[PDB]
Symmetry: D2
Subunit: 378 residues, 4 copies
């Protein structure tokens, strides 16, 4: 059952999504804007940092609540849902790995109505699916770590006030040689590259980062040296459920437009909703959205429960929800016919946005591998 | 949350399925046997009539409990799960439509450890998907109804002690002209036709029934004249969730055999579980089984709650669970390679059994129409 | 076997596609440009009007040749292939329906290296899949027809020198009440609406047309009054094969980028081409492209032969080729991972372009209906 | 273009398939009979050994002709088509690898109207997809090879007069250590195991073979020692096109029954052919059959031409044709509703038969690997 606080938060999110976020979505994509209005509004409503612990002035809502929020935002603006995914994802390594000292030092600035942003920087040109191939190095030198390397596809990378950077402290130790570091905006040696032009989720920032003899305090390390890969893998287990929730939302939003169109669009003397093939298309789309929603909610509940099964169910939810978003948005454009292909009608943007969900937070090939390995090697 | 009585019932069902039902499945299919051992065992354990109300000496365990039982039996023997589907389905019209007098007269004989069987007779050669095209007639004549017609594909039809027969009392009134009647075994004019040879679910009885001037007491009518189509439609809404549960079970049983085979079968110097394409196949199969399971459990809970949404969610569950059973069993035979095609290894039977789930309780074309209509014309 | 003239034309097209069309494709989409360079180049090389008869100063290459050209152009720029589809489609009603007088009067201006454009205007806001619902009217008044109505989604509509307009001359006669007319650019009463902003094929012009008491010479009618629907249906049978060829090309071009990426992209210590799931993805993509190509070539050959089977095989080719373009481009973006979602790498544009092929020249729901009707009611 | 001799052969095959083979198919499956009538009839009509060279008293009709024959037989009886696949497959290693002396000695007995049978024995319990893992050994001892080992799933193994046996002459040399041998029926040490009970293609013989100190003349070796794996791989490239052709036939036969049923079956007051979803199902089934047919014919033509591309196109044809047979037969049973599940109506047998085409001649996972490797490593 949902708590009264969860129900109040979700009623507020649904209201904000409908009244404020949905009317802004077309322009956000058309002009490739960072959702500054949404970011500031969310900060004021206490929606920007839902997983920030109560100890650091946060709402500490849990994974299920954020999954429900993401579905609501994904329904109207995938890019606005991405802001919340990147924001929570950027602080999870600190919340789950940081010492009490590091947590107080860096989480406090995100308290209450703070508008400060986070980012997670793991991916590199040489390390996408193969994260162990990352080349960024962190070398201890007195009271500092000297970081040299690069990162790419970093959501909110160039605007984040706090970035969690993964780097090898010992390349010879492989999966036991990566460490995680808090890197602040304004650190000398932190260089911003290009903001890449994407097919979809255009109302976002996706940055290249360069570290050129970047010195960070030795006390900025998250956990012990060599525990970074485990910290990253734990963070990915959670963010895959966020991706799943956003994909369920995208699929639902596209389905809602398709359904309304079948009721209003008249061909062959009646609304197209009267045609059996249109009914079958809508039946298949809705069934896949509901199945993806149930898998996602189960995975989110398991994460909140600290259940080991969360890895398997989150991997299933991510694969199915994103494949469903791709298939449903492709069919929603189809249901609208020619009008579906027009930018003014939104479903084409939802289709472009959907494609990213199959790729980021780990591709659906990697998530099928994670699922298969969990099933065959329990 | 599951009650302690539900948990005890399910632990017992899982034990019986593994120890008693699974070792009998190969012979049940090979020799096309009625599962008499299972029927008698279920009666003794109070598993034969789970939906029989407490008022008539029943366990009244509800739809969710029966869905969980059907998934457990479907895992090892689809034909044994069909015995429970047919048994419950045959008494639902009486439980939900019969007068207090009719219910006492006919439901009492199913109390406790009774081994008496039921059947539902609606389908005819001229009326499958188009149930309104049924030709069986019931004519009031004094204190009796004289029934003339035929039925086909009637599960347990030739062995049922009580048969619910649907017949037109007024052919001109269509959906308002059908009535439902209790017909007992041994009634003069009740004639048995052939027991049809099927592709799968061979451990069952599928009967043709003929009614030749068959006189039934006027007090054997279920509800008022003309309410039979609504009674039938209500029964099918529930029956579709039972089909879904059996299909989830079939899919799970096939998946279990496939998983065990990947772990034991060595090719290219290692178990085939180490091959990425095999991991992807298993990932896809498990994800579809879990999604079908969640949809089915939701539909079952909605039916128990008496929620109007149960029609939509049951229709989605039936379509997806049966398509998943067909897809998963086809892939489980694939995972076993040549051994998968051999009768001794069970998965080929599961594949044959799975195909029926897409057809009976209404085809997946009819269920997609029901889903689409519920979504587009709420 | 291909004629020596066909082989020379195709070698030239392949050269032009690689050297001239492919380097222009990114900018054509980015800046939504009409492919003026391509149009002028094609006119000089005799590629703009391949189906123009030799009698009117044309190359009269036939359907198979144009299908092969469209696959070659579709591989590098779907929008440039669309220019040739719209160009041929706009003159087919005149070639196949026009009197010798009308053909001389209007086809002569397209002779040799002419750069003049055609368009076909059938679709309206009220008439997409249901073409019989078109509202445009043509009323005979002395030596003129007065045309009143509107058209939408007209490829090259606002730039065409000659437009074939379909309109009712007798609304009470339905399929026997539509007529086709030659409408010239500069005719008083011809009004241009908006050029719609689309998801893909952005290097094109898609116009709204309005006819406000538009007077056309009575001698501009194509064939007899009431034969317009048959003329339109014959034109659609051919243009569906052109759509199929363009879709085969799009799918091939996306596959080529994906294949090259698997060979160059190293993850897990080797190019990703060494990973079995990547090999399976590429196997499935290539198989679907080849099957679509063989169906399309068969349909094109049947059209050239004047074979009645061309309707069935063209409908199959259109459905499969466009579904294949959608599925293959979606998977090509997947194979490139994050880089696949970036505008600089082309496959995302190919994915956006692919979606239109499932919708225009009749949706894949209409083409499945055409196929099904031809199979079940021969 | 088809030769007049090919057209005469195919008209004869179509006549025989309709008049003689189709009426026998139900009983052949029901009673698991070897198609002795068909074998004897084919021998008399010169259809049993189509690839036997003219030099050894054969028709030498080529791969395309046999592919067309297999599609015709697959349409009515997959098991009868399997007899021709096994027969040709069993002599291909000798035709393509045997010395002139060995070819005269063993191929002559198959001349004209001979009813003698062949078999190919490569697969073993330890070696299915991984053929290099085969354990059968051949040890040179004077003028003989002493063979020890076992084989399983050998089509016509227990009834073949000539068996091509693959065995290691040098286990340490892997792919360069296998040799191929002619083994005659009646050789001491040749032991027959069980004839395995299968899901489908029941009108066949699937044998276990044991070689217990089995002495064969040293002159019975096919080619040089160690060339056996190349000989086997070459045979499989051809055998995969035969599987594809049989699968196209199975799919077509199931489609034909489905089409006829839609025309005859009345529901909702009209034949079910009038329902749009039924038209879509038939459209999809026919499109996949035609695409599979075109791929198969292309692959067969390339094999006859001795073109290197035959490996790639044969692998694509095998995968798509067999997946299409599985999908189309599953949907043909669906189109017949309850009647589709009944043994008397044939489509259920076609569905059971179709599943084997995805497994034998190499699984569809192995064929996707072969396709992907050929595309990515040309
Ligand atoms: C799965 C994976 C490919 C890694 O497997 P390999 O075969 O290389 O390595 P292998 O031999 O399987 O494993 C190594 C060690 O790792 C431990 N471990 C694994 N999972 C976990 C776990 N869940 N928890 C703890 N330890 C784990 C494993 O046990 C092993 O240690 P061991 O040797 O046994 O002692 C991994 O790299 C991955 O997942 N890539 C997807 C990238 C990817 O997902 N970006 C996402 C970037 S962020 C995202 O894209 C966005 C952020 C926010 C905005 C939205 C997008
Ligand atoms: C859906 C269906 C095809 C009927 O739709 P049409 O278009 O003909 O009729 P239409 O105009 O849509 O409707 C008529 C009236 O019917 C009322 N109603 C519908 N659903 C319901 C409902 N759920 N509850 C109450 N009333 C309902 C409807 O409102 C209408 O009355 P009205 O005119 O409005 O006053 C129906 O016949 C069906 O479903 N066939 C599948 C067969 C099929 O499922 N066998 C199963 C046989 S049993 C089974 O196979 C096994 C038994 C046990 C062993 C396992 C197998
Ligand atoms: C198939 C269709 C939906 C029409 O079927 P209904 O059920 O309404 O009408 P129904 O009762 O089936 O039929 C009426 C008469 O029509 C004759 N006929 C049909 N096919 C043909 C044929 N092939 N040849 C001659 N006559 C035909 C039919 O026999 C009948 O006459 P009858 O009563 O028997 O005497 C049709 O409207 C259509 O197809 N829409 C797709 C739109 C669509 O395809 N735009 C494309 C616009 S152009 C395009 O989008 C682009 C142009 C160039 C750039 C690329 C895009
Ligand atoms: C593809 C395969 C899995 C083999 O790949 P691996 O990764 O182990 O070995 P790898 O490293 O790729 O290769 C080894 C050598 O082999 C040469 N070669 C490959 N293809 C060919 C070829 N087409 N021609 C000549 N040489 C070939 C390869 O070059 C290599 O030699 P090299 O080292 O380079 O010098 C193979 O074993 C296979 O295919 N299994 C399917 C079984 C299977 O198909 N039964 C069918 C049994 S029969 C059938 O089931 C029926 C008979 C009649 C009734 C119907 C059913
Ligand atoms: C817009 C965007 C935002 C995202 N934001 C973040 C962020 O905030 N922080 C961050 O660190 N990263 C981020 N990601 C990175 C992201 O997670 C990846 O791009 C993803 O992991 C894929 O890596 P890649 O792009 O290098 O593709 P590659 O790994 O090169 O994959 C190419 C293809 O090979 C397949 N493949 C690779 N390995 C295997 C295998 N072992 N088995 C089977 N198939 C395989 C893949 O599935 C894919 O189809 C972002 C990416 C994008 C594009
Ligand atoms: C083993 C078995 C047991 C079952 N047990 C019971 C039982 O106990 N009691 C009972 O009364 N019945 C029973 N059924 C009957 C069953 O529900 C049906 O067979 C089913 O409703 C299909 O009817 P049909 O066989 O007449 O097929 P048809 O209705 O003829 O359908 C043929 C094809 O047409 C399609 N089709 C039909 N109408 C439409 C439409 N409007 N839109 C789109 N497509 C459509 C169908 O989906 C199907 O693909 C049993 C059937 C079998 C085979
Ligand atoms: C970029 C572009 C260019 C094209 N260029 C040309 C041009 O040059 N000239 C021209 O005249 N037209 C052109 N077309 C028009 C085009 O062919 C159509 O848009 C198409 O016919 C669909 O019509 P619609 O957009 O009104 O969709 P609708 O007909 O409203 O269809 C909406 C949905 O309902 C489904 N549907 C409709 N009827 C049925 C049915 N009977 N059965 C099952 N499902 C059905 C459709 O498949 C679709 O999924 C163009 C369109 C676009 C978008
Ligand atoms: C009725 C029948 C007749 C046939 N007749 C002949 C005959 O006449 N002569 C003969 O020699 N053989 C014959 N075959 C053998 C046949 O070709 C095989 O059964 C087939 O090669 C699969 O081998 P397997 O059964 O050992 O399955 P396995 O190889 O154990 O495969 C099990 C599963 O693992 C998958 N798998 C295995 N390797 C890989 C890989 N590298 N990558 C991805 N997935 C993989 C497979 O696709 C399959 O899904 C026959 C088989 C049958 C059942």
């Amino acid at each position: 059952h949902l708590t009264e606080e969860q129900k109040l938060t979700l009623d507020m999110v649904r209201d904000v999504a409908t009244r404020e976020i949905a009317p802004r979505a077309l322009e956000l994509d058309e002009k490739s804007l960072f959702p500054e209005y949404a970011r500031d509004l969310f900060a004021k409503l206490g929606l920007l940092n839902p997983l920030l612990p109560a100890a650091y002035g946060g709402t500490e809502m849990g994974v299920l609540t954020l999954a429900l929020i993401l579905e609501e935002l994904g329904r109207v603006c995938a890019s606005t849902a991405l802001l919340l995914i990147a924001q929570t994802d950027g602080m999870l390594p600190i919340i789950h790995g940081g010492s009490p000292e590091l947590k107080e030092r860096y989480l406090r600035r995100f308290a209450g109505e703070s508008t400060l942003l986070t980012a997670l920087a793991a991916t590199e040109p040489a390390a996408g699916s193969d994260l162990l191939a990352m080349k960024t190095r962190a070398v201890r030198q007195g009271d500092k770590y000297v970081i040299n390397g690069q990162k790419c596809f970093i959501t909110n990378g160039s605007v984040a006030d706090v970035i969690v950077v993964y780097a090898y402290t010992d390349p010879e130790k492989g999966s036991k040689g990566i460490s995680a570091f808090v890197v602040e905006k304004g650190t000398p040696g932190l260089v911003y590259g290009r903001n890449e032009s994407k097919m979809g989720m255009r109302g976002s920032i996706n940055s290249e980062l360069f570290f050129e003899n970047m010195e960070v305090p030795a006390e900025n390390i998250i956990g012990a040296e060599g525990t970074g890969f485990a910290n990253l893998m734990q963070t990915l287990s959670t963010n895959r459920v966020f991706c799943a929730a956003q994909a369920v939302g995208i699929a639902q939003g596209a389905l809602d437009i398709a359904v309304r169109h079948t009721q209003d669009r008249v061909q062959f003397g009646k609304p197209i909703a009267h045609l059996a093939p249109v009914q079958f298309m809508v039946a298949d789309m809705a069934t896949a959205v509901e199945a993806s929603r149930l898998l996602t909610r189960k995975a989110a509940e398991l994460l909140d429960d600290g259940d080991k099964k969360a890895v398997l169910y989150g991997s299933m939810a991510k694969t199915m929800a994103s494949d469903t978003a791709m298939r449903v948005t492709t069919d929603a454009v189809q249901v609208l016919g020619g009008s579906g292909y027009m930018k003014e009608n939104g479903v084409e943007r939802m289709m472009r946005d959907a494609k990213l969900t199959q790729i980021y937070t780990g591709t659906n090939q990697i998530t099928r591998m994670v699922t298969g390995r969990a099933l065959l090697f329990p």
